[PDB]
Design a protein around this ligand. Structure first.
Ligand SMILES: CN(C)C(=O)c1cccc(Nc2nc(OCC3CCCCC3)c3[nH]cnc3n2)c1
Length: 255
């Protein structure tokens, strides 16, 4: 059993609390109480799927607690001392300091490794797609290594992939599109498409145009991020094609 320190916040899946076993962790509070037998069964399936993922750049699963009185499944996971990537981005904006290209390459490399484990399971395993890849779902450890978490169970691109816009199923290249949006935003300190309404946003995406990332950043880094933002999913690189990029070196794999 564990002790609750405080509530960190509330995600779309439910509340997340900082807890202590004296190992510091978090749990995600998944309330199955309004669910039918069928819906609860789906929940079990997804949680069992996600439970299997293991990777140094994926938030580590630790345990599950079934609390029948509270009608709640508590999913115990790694606490990430460094916070989220969103706060890094807002920090850069406030300080008027762009992130170093080296740090961007570390984030791109580690997130792509994380997604590689999902898209290409190292252990046989059923493929998983993240489905909610945005700076708020990317956490950081004490050394600011990437820990991808909060797997998916506005006038912002993150909630409009071209697959959504075209009524086609979310696929692995839809994850890559979101990765492109995220890395773009890390470099420019703003998303590649901005708008006041979904309609205006859809218009901007459909044109597929956006500013170059800042000239701080090499042509090679601009090109691979841009490639992830191709309108056609088959023009976007797979995780293997990303990792083959000449920019990505051994030391980008862990800091
Ligand atoms: C808003 N935010 C990221 C924080 O307050 C914060 C600050 C320092 C360390 C952490 N550390 C952390 N935060 C998490 O989820 C954050 C929570 C999720 C629901 C939406 C609001 C914010 C974690 N999930 C798994 N491991 C985690 N480690 C979070």
């Amino acid at each position: 059993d564990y002790e609750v320190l405080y509530t960190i916040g509330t995600g779309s899946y439910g509340r997340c609390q900082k807890i202590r076993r004296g190992k510091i962790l978090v749990w995600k509070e998944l309330d199955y109480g309004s669910m039918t037998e069928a819906e609860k069964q789906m929940l079990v399936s997804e949680v069992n799927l996600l439970r299997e993922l293991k990777h140094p750049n994926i938030v580590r699963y630790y345990d599950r607690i079934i609390d029948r009185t509270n009608t709640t499944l508590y999913i115990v996971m790694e606490y990430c001392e460094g916070g989220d990537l969103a706060s890094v981005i807002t920090k850069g904006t406030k300080e008027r300091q762009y992130l170093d290209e080296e740090f961007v390459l570390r984030v791109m490399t580690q997130l792509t490794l994380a997604l590689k484990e999902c898209h290409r399971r190292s252990d046989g395993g059923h493929t998983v797609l993240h489905r909610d890849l945005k700076p708020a779902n990317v956490f950081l450890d004490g050394k600011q290594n990437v820990k991808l978490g909060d797997f998916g169970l506005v006038g912002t691109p993150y909630y409009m992939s071209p697959e959504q816009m075209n009524r086609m199923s979310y696929n692995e290249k839809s994850d890559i599109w979101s990765l492109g949006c995220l890395l773009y935003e890390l470099c420019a300190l703003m998303p590649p498409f901005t708008a006041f309404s979904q309609k205006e946003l859809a218009g901007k995406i459909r044109e597929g145009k956006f500013r170059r990332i800042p000239y701080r950043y090499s042509d090679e880094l601009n090109e691979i991020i841009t490639r992830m933002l191709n309108l056609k999913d088959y023009h976007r690189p797979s995780v293997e094609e990303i990792l083959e990029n000449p920019l990505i070196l051994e030391h980008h794999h862990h800091h």
